[PDB]
């Protein structure tokens, strides 16, 4: 609350529109982090089961232009390109939702006179169901899980996919 | 590390080039450092400077960069 | 995920995204009452 108000004072432009450190930003980032944990699980499954075609094939620079060449004389693999385009799909959905939101949906950028949602605090009420409390709880948990997964991958030396698999118990692959 | 062996024969490279506008001829023309990627050859003399100072490995330069980041902070 | 991917990951960012966002925000700031 104090931090929220102080930020509203420091950066009136972002806070007035709902950007920055706000409850709306927390909710949106929790949404994206949950979707991202799902995406990591799904890519783990696909890579483990070999569902990605020509995963280790290096894209041709002659066909796909200089963009197909990586930083240090390396080539982007078909798997990386496929996953990137999969992300491009949801990114275009994102741009369309942000500029032209559904009438019922929550908007990324809030109006000038919008009423900020009440800061939940330590934990929202445990309202079990498709509730805005459950959404925030699971979004916070997913964001923390993303950070923990990256840190475990860097520390233990395993891949992010390997760490997700290990944690899930090797059910994925 | 390969310049501190034959500094009078090896050209010192400043940084790699990643331009999505280069053609294959340009990538090949800029792979002169024996590094297998397009590069810029330094004209600042930092190689000679550091070699004289006592820098021999890339880890020395990396530690120096870490310290200078800490000092900027 | 190796460091060799970092140029291809960053140069488009630093050269098209950072300038675009900076220009938009600075435009909003300079023309604002």
């Amino acid at each position: 609350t104090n931090a929220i108000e102080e930020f509203a004072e420091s950066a009136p432009e972002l806070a007035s529109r709902g950007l920055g450190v706000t409850t709306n930003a927390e909710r949106w980032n929790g949404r994206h982090a949950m979707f991202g944990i799902f995406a990591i699980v799904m890519t783990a499954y696909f890579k483990g089961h070999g569902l990605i075609p020509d995963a280790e094939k290096i894209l041709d620079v002659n066909q796909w232009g200089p963009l197909a060449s990586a930083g240090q004389g390396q080539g982007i693999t078909n798997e990386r390109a496929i996953i990137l385009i999969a992300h491009v799909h949801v990114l275009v959905v994102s741009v369309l939702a942000a500029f032209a939101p559904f009438q019922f949906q929550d908007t990324l950028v809030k109006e000038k006179g919008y009423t900020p949602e009440a800061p939940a605090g330590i934990i929202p009420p445990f309202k079990t169901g498709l509730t805005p409390e459950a959404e925030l709880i699971n979004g916070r948990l997913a964001m923390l899980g993303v950070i923990s997964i990256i840190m475990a991958s860097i520390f233990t030396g395993n891949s992010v996919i390997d760490v997700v698999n290990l944690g899930l118990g090797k059910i994925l692959f | 590390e390969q310049w501190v062996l034959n500094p009078l024969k090896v050209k010192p490279v400043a940084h790699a080039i990643w331009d999505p506008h280069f053609g294959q001829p340009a990538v090949k023309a800029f792979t002169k450092g024996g590094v297998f990627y397009p590069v810029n050859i330094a004209t600042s003399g930092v190689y000679h400077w550091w070699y004289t100072i006592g820098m021999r490995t890339n880890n020395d330069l990396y530690a120096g960069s870490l310290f200078l980041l800490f000092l900027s902070g | 995920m190796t460091a060799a991917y970092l140029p291809s990951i960053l140069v488009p960012l630093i050269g098209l995204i950072f300038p675009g966002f900076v220009m938009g925000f600075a435009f909003i700031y300079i023309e604002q009452e």
Binding site: - | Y62, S65, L66, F70 | -
Partner: peptide, 30 residues
């Protein structure tokens, strides 16, 4: 020779310096 962990430590220090630079920019803008 320079490992990805090393590049990541460098990036973390860069991020800390960026945070401090934003703080200094605010304090100077005042």
């Amino acid at each position: 020779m320079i490992s990805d962990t090393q590049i990541f430590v460098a990036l973390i220090l860069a991020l800390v310096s960026l945070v401090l630079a934003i703080r200094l920019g605010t304090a100077l803008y005042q």
